[PDB]
Amino acid sequence: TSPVIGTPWKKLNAPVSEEALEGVDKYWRVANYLSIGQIYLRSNPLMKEPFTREDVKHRLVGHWGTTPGLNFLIGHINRFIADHGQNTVIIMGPGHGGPAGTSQSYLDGTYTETFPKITKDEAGLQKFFRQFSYPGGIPSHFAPETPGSIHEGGELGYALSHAYGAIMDNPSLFVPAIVGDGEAETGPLATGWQSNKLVNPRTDGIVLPILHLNGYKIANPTILSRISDEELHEFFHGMGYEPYEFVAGFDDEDHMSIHRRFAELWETIWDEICDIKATAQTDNVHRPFYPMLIFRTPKGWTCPKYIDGKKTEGSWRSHQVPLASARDTEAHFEVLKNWLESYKPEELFDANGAVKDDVLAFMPKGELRIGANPNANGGVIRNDLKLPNLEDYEVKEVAEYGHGWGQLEATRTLG
């Protein structure tokens, strides 16, 4: 059966520490940098003099638009995991946010553990950037090759069915399930919201659905981000959820206020989940309203606002790559260079190219890490079934009466 991992369903009973929030902000910067490096760079990962157009990959593959939002969420979830010791698996619904998943596994240390050639220094960082979506490297999506994935999310709409399947008979497991707002338009996702009527908060775990409401899919706005906020809240409340909304990045709020605001809302949500779990130890006959998070952020958050006079941050234009060929024009290379420098990698990486200790000192350790949780490599949990003796169910009458006897319904035997 499922292992009980960690100290599940524990409240914090303190504000989030300012130091942990500085951890989360550095995580977001370096994961964003490492996501961009994987998309754009074939050489010179830390932009040593000279950083020129030759360091840019000849063909740009991958998706920026969902990625900085995923890096934000993943940073805060890692802080949450280390502070609470919660058994946690993430479902990355926008699975084309591959660079966030690989960046996470690189930062939590499970990537170098699993893939010993990709070291935590400047030559390993070069190999890390070149290999992404490249001939003989690793895939564009959150593929089974990535530590921490149980869901590639290439084909969209199964995030919630997979989230709820994961928590069945898994009462210590917390699953933050990130749902694309375009992905929420699909058939399979739309019915997946009702799965909370099929789970039990005592005998099963907890899914927190996170609607990645960035406003855009590939080339269109999203239905759920263009309907009214009252309709959107009524919708989730109608499906048995208690919705919480977070809005960020559409003004000039400094990034540290955003993190504090988010950590406060996260801990309020988590206190609601711990209450549900504590109540279910006594009353699991009455279905709670589960929390869900509406995460409303600009698509492509922290990319340059305008590229060639077209709105890129907060648009569908940031979906694949905001900047379309940084290898072909001096102007576009300079945009890429300034973008990479906006995260200030001189503060993130040390002289050897390792991510600095104070970037990652908030991270979880051990089996609680996203890429090391056994629920994300579930073959390690699985045992052979105790199977009953097959002759107890055999139709013996063939041997008595002859081949071709009877009018049995074969599936009753299997039953």
Ligand X SMILES: Cc1ncc(C[n+]2csc(CCOP(=O)(O)OP(=O)(O)O)c2C)c(N)n1
Interface positions with ligand X (CB under 6 A): 65-66, 94, 96, 155-157, 180-183, 186, 212, 214, 216-218, 222, 299, 319
CA distance to 325, 331, 349, per residue, from 340 (Å): 15, 15, 13
- Our finding on whether 250 is near a copy of itself (CB under 8 A) is yes
Residue from 169, 234, 264, 275 binding a copy of itself (CB under 8 A): 275
The answer to whether residues 105 and 111 touch, using CB atoms and an 8 Å cutoff, is: yes
Q: Which stretch binds a copy of itself (CB under 8 A): 64-72, 206-214, 277-285, 403-411?
A: 277-285
Q: In angstroms, what is the C-alpha Rg of the chain?
A: 24
- Our finding on whether 252 is near a copy of itself (CB under 8 A) is yes
- Our finding on whether 282 is near a copy of itself (CB under 8 A) is yes
The answer to whether residues 40 and 56 touch, using CB atoms and an 8 Å cutoff, is: yes
Of residues 78 and 87, the one with the C-beta less far from a copy of itself = 87
The DSSP bridge pattern shows strands 310-311 and 306-307 to be antiparallel
Q: Tell me how far, at minimum, the Cβ of 182 lies from Ca ion, in Å.
A: 5
Of residues 181 and 204, the one with the C-beta less far from Ca ion = 181
Of residues 18 and 397, the one with the C-beta less far from a copy of itself = 18
DSSP bridge pairs for 208:
176
Of residues 2 and 32, the one with the C-beta less far from Ca ion = 32
| Cα distance between residue 151 and residue 167, in whole Å | 14
Backbone phi, then psi, for 303, in 5-degree steps? -70, 165
Interaction site with Ca ion (CB under 5 A):
181-182, 214
| Cα distance between residue 299 and residue 103, in whole Å | 19
The answer to whether residues 24 and 83 touch, using CB atoms and an 8 Å cutoff, is: no
Q: Tell me how far, at minimum, the Cβ of 186 lies from ligand X, in Å.
A: 6
Residue from 17, 279, 342, 377 binding a copy of itself (CB under 8 A): 279
Q: Which stretch binds a copy of itself (CB under 8 A): 51-59, 134-142, 176-184, 249-257?
A: 249-257
Question: Which H/E stretch holds residue 187?
Answer: helix 187-192
Look up tokens 């940084």; give the residue.
326
Of residues 256 and 381, the one with the C-beta less far from a copy of itself = 256
Of residues 128 and 216, the one with the C-beta less far from a copy of itself = 216
DSSP bridge pairs for 296:
213, 247
> Which residues of the chain form contacts with a copy of itself (CB under 8 A)?
10-11, 250-252, 274-275, 278-279, 281-282, 298, 314
